[PDB]
Amino acid sequence: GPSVFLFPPKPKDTLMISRTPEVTCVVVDVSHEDPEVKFNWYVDGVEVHNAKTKPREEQYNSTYRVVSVLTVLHQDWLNGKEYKCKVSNKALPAPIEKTISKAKGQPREPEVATFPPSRDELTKNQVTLVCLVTGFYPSDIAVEWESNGQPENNYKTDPPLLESQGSFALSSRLRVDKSRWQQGNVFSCSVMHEALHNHYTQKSLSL
C-alpha cells in the first residue's frame, strides 16, 4: 500500500433522479509516518472539485482508511462518462490513478413477468410468488417486491445471468403467508433499469 479501490454508484441511485449516486474512492494502508492523502477527481479528463473527503479513520491494524465520495450526475453516469480518482501520498512512489465507468454495451429493455403460486404449494402455509426478468442489458438492475406502497420482507433475488444472445435474466421470488394471498392482497414486482421508459416498470398480481 497505500492501495486504492474505486467503486461505482448503485443502479437504483443512478436510475431514480431524487436519489444520490456516488462514486466512492477508498484508500487503505495509509501509514502513520506518511498520513497525507490528496484526492484529485476527473470526469472524462475534466478536473472537478465537489468531492466530500471524509476524515481519515484508524483501523485496528494501525493504518488509516480514507474515503472520498464524489457525487455524480445521473445522466453523466448513464451516458458513459469516465470517473478517475487520483491518489497521492509520500509513502507511495508515483500517484495511483483508477478509473471507472458504466458497463459498456447497447441497452436492452427487460421483459417482466409475474407468476402466481402453484396449486400444490397452496397446501403449505408459506407460498411463493415469482417475478421473471429477462432480456436486459446491461446487468445493472434493481428488482424489488412490494405491497400497498411498502417493501415486502421475505424475498430473494438471484444475480443476473447471461443468456445465449448476450442479454441478462434473473428471477425474484417472494415468500408470503397463504392467508395474505387468499384474501386478495396485491403484490407488485418493481423493476428499475436504464432501458425502461422512465427507468421504471411495475407488474402486479393477486388471487
Add this chain to the structure above:
Amino acid sequence: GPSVFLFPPKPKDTLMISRTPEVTCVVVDVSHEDPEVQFKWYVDGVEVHNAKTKPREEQYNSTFRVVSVLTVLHQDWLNGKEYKCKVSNKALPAPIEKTISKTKGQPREPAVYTLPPSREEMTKNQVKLVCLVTGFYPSDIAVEWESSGQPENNYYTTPPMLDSDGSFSLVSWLNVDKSRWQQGNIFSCSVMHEALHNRFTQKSLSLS
C-alpha cells in the same frame, strides 16, 4: 511443478445408480527428465487398487499430463467417504497428496414447483416455463428440462443461492416456441438431489 489437481464426480453421476461417478486426479508439469508418475489411491485412508491410469500425454509446452480415474461407489460418495490421490514423482521432494469428499451438512429435500407462462409473454414467439427449486441442502443438484422422454436443453438455471434458513434455492426456466405450448405438449422439470426419495423427482405442466 509437478502440480496435482483432484476433481469430484458430478452430482447426476453420484445420484443415478446406472451412471458412473468418477474422481479424477490430474498431474501437470511432469518433466521429460522425470516422467514417471505413481498414483496411490485411498478411501478413508485405506488404499484401493481399481484406478485406471491413462498413459502420459505430451503437452505443447513440453510437459506431460497424466490422469488417473477412480470409479467410486455411489453410496460411498454419498456417505461422505474421503478420496485421497497421492502422486509420487522424482522431481518432487515429497509426494503430493490431495483429498476430496462430498460437501458436508445435513441433507434437506428440495420442494419443486413449476409455473406456467404469463399471458403477456404469449405475444412473443418464445415462451418461458419456470421451475422453482427451494429448501435444499447440500447445493449439489441437477435440474433438467424434458418433454416426451427427451431433453429440452434451451434453458438456463441460476446457481444455487443461499436462503435465510440455511438451505439453497434456484430457478430454471425453459425457452420454448409458443406453438409447442399451445398445442398441449407436456414439459417436465426433473430434479436430482440426494435428499429426495429415489434421488429424483419430476414435475410437469401443460396448457389446460
